[PDB]
Amino acid sequence: SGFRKMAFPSGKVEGCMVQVTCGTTTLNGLWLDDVVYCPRHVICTSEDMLNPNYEDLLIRKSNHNFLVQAGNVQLRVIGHSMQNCVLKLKVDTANPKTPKYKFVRIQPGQTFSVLACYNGSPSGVYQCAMRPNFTIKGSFLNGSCGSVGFNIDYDCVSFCYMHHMELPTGVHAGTDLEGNFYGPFVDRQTAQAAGTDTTITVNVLAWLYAAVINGDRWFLNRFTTTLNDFNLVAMKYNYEPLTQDHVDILGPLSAQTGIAVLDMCASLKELLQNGMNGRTILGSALLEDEFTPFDVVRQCSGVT
Amino acid sequence: SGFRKMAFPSGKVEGCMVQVTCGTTTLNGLWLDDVVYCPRHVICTSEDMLNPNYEDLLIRKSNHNFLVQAGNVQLRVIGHSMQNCVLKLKVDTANPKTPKYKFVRIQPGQTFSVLACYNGSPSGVYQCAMRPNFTIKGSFLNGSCGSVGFNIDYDCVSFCYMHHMELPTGVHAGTDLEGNFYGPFVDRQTAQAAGTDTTITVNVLAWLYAAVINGDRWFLNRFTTTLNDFNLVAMKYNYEPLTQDHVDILGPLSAQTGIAVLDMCASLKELLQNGMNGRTILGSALLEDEFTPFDVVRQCSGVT
Numbered sequence: 001s002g003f004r005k006m007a008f009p010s011g012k013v014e015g016c017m018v019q020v021t022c023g024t025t026t027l028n029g030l031w032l033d034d035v036v037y038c039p040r041h042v043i044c045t046s047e048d049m050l051n052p053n054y055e056d057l058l059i060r061k062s063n064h065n066f067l068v069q070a071g072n073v074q075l076r077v078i079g080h081s082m083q084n085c086v087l088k089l090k091v092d093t094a095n096p097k098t099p100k101y102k103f104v105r106i107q108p109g110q111t112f113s114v115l116a117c118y119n120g121s122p123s124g125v126y127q128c129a130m131r132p133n134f135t136i137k138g139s140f141l142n143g144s145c146g147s148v149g150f151n152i153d154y155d156c157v158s159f160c161y162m163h164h165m166e167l168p169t170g171v172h173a174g175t176d177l178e179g180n181f182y183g184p185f186v187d188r189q190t191a192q193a194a195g196t197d198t199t200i201t202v203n204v205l206a207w208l209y210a211a212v213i214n215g216d217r218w219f220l221n222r223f224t225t226t227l228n229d230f231n232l233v234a235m236k237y238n239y240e241p242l243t244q245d246h247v248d249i250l251g252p253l254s255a256q257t258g259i260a261v262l263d264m265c266a267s268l269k270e271l272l273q274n275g276m277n278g279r280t281i282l283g284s285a286l287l288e289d290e291f292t293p294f295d296v297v298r299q300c301s302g303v304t
Numbered sequence: 305s306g307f308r309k310m311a312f313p314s315g316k317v318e319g320c321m322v323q324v325t326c327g328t329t330t331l332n333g334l335w336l337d338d339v340v341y342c343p344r345h346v347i348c349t350s351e352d353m354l355n356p357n358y359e360d361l362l363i364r365k366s367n368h369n370f371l372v373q374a375g376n377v378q379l380r381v382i383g384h385s386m387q388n389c390v391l392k393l394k395v396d397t398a399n400p401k402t403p404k405y406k407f408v409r410i411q412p413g414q415t416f417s418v419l420a421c422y423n424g425s426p427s428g429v430y431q432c433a434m435r436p437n438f439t440i441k442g443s444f445l446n447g448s449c450g451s452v453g454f455n456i457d458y459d460c461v462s463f464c465y466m467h468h469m470e471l472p473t474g475v476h477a478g479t480d481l482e483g484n485f486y487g488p489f490v491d492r493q494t495a496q497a498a499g500t501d502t503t504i505t506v507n508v509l510a511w512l513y514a515a516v517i518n519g520d521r522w523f524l525n526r527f528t529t530t531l532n533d534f535n536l537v538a539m540k541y542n543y544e545p546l547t548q549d550h551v552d553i554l555g556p557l558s559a560q561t562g563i564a565v566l567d568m569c570a571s572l573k574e575l576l577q578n579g580m581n582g583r584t585i586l587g588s589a590l591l592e593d594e595f596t597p598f599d600v601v602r603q604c605s606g607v608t
């Protein structure tokens with residue numbers, strides 16, 4: 001019973017958090033094996049961020065300019081390289097707490113947990129989704145850069161996000177663990193506006209199945225629809241177009257509840273057209289799009 | 305920038321989770337020092353839960369009937385006692401991962417993180433609040449009993465909740481770590497209905513300050529009110545009566561934003577009377593009451 005915006009347990013990622021200082025800039029680093037991953041803008045001053053030339057700025061940095069602190073003990077930096085927008089600091093000690101891990105680049109719509117950190121120390125964990133415009137609606141202040149986003153499959157942590165930037169509109173931009181930015185963003189203190197933040201339709205449907213599973217059924221109607229008819233309505237309300245691939249992924253939820261995917265789409269169509277009329281679904285007065293069909297299955301089954 | 309329903313990092317609590325089996329019932333235990341804490345209903349079968357006499361049922365249980373497993377290794381049970389609705393299993397080994405801890409009984413309105421567990425393994429972490437009717441709106445399935453609720457102050461984990469029961473309405477009931485139930489609930493498979501779930505007013509106001517801090521200001525109006533006038537409106541909308549103690553606790557938020565507590569109460573009064581007119585505040589279409597004034601301060605300042 002109950003449906004909560006649930007993050008993965010963060011212990012495996014807490015044991016990887018370090019503080020990285022270069023000159024007078026301090027941010028977070030991720031220590032996996034003998035490598036510390038951090039945003040390359042750690043080498044920048046506020047003057048540098050206007051139009052930084054990172055290859056040029058890196059020339060004036062040596063291994064001894066990067067101060068890596070784990071807890072309260074100093075790690076010895078024996079190498080450094082730049083891969084896209086992240087710095088990789090080779091340290092002389094493998095992290096004893098390194099869990100089983102992969103680096104994965106997620107697609108928009110996919111959700112993940114963020115362990116927000118300041119000065120190598122964790123402050124909290126929350127669930128996010130990679131928006132269709134490649135931003136994330138996180139909760140980050142100055143000092144949080146280098147905090148990571150991740151998913152866990154039993155004992156393997158798939159790191160998918162590293163926090164880099166706050167856009168002028170309060171939304172956030174970052175890279176995968178190879179330093180490649182999600183979306184068109186660049187690590188520069190330049191006005192970069194986000195694209196349309198459309199609703200993740202497959203996620204709304206998944207959350208409507210989670211609601212049916214937990215008792216909220218008022219929104220189930222007597223209608224059905226087709227993918228093309230649903231998509232006309234989805235376009236009007238800035239919802240992502242629903243594909244047969246999304247229908248396939250909703251299959252286990254459709255099988256458990258006995259409600260066909262297209263029938264649930266007609267319910268979602270009526271919810272868009274009429275609104276919720278002062279009602280709630282799973283304690284929310286709007287249609288939640290940050291639970292994937294996998295998240296609903298996991299939460300509703302008890303996957304540990 | 306951004307405001308998220310954030311849980312505390314769960315690593316310190318993950319290192320305390322064990323699996324407790326008694327006969328054919330398996331649930332979660334909390335291993336702190338040389339003691340394992342778990343719900344006393346671990347000794348019950350489904351037949352026993354109808355009208356259990358726990359003192360009588362405990363007579364037929366010996367130390368060797370409690371199987372405590374940490375990871376995949378077995379802990380030796382050298383003692384057992386019942387304290388209210390929890391069992392305390394004395395083990396022969398202190399938990400090497402025991403963090404600094406306290407046991408605290410929280411008041412309704414107070415928030416905490418829950419590490420949901422199944423078979424001693426963590427599945428996820430989310431933020432909760434102790435409702436004014438002493439229930440929590442968690443996300444728990446069969447097997448989750450013994451999962452705990454907690455707050456962290458730097459290095460000290462204050463354990464405040466142990467999950468015991470699911471009421472017939474899908475809401476949850478549990479004890480503090482002394483085995484004392486929050487509210488009037490009893491660990492028996494008997495219909496127990498919850499009281500009125502009123503809104504935590506001090507928390508809504510705190511979240512309105514968090515919204516002003518992050519840019520959502522449309523709801524700020526030209527009005528002010530008094531505590532007695534606000535409370536007449538609060539009574540009508542099933543909101544907890546606001547006291548001067550709540551006003552005092554909102555003081556730091558009032559000081560940061562420069563918006564008097566009573567002025568923010570008049571904004572909340574108009575939001576109750578008129579609704580949100582299809583608008584949102586911090587991405588929500590309803591007034592959020594599961595952030596305390598302390599949570600807003602911590603999240604908005606970056607306390608690690």
Ligand SMILES: Cc1ccncc1N(C)C(=O)Cc1cccc(Cl)c1
Pocket residue numbers: 041049140141142143144145164165166167186187188189190305
């Ligand atoms: C202030 C803040 C709040 C939340 N998250 C991040 C920040 N910071 C530190 C930045 O955006 C810095 C920055 C500026 C310009 C480009 C880049 Cl790559 C980084």
Ligand SMILES: Cc1ccncc1N(C)C(=O)Cc1cccc(Cl)c1
Pocket residue numbers: 001345353444445446447448449468469470471490491492493494
């Ligand atoms: C099914 C479920 C779902 C979510 N959380 C808990 C449960 N369980 C296991 C119970 O409520 C058992 C129980 C029944 C009656 C009294 C008590 Cl003290 C415990």
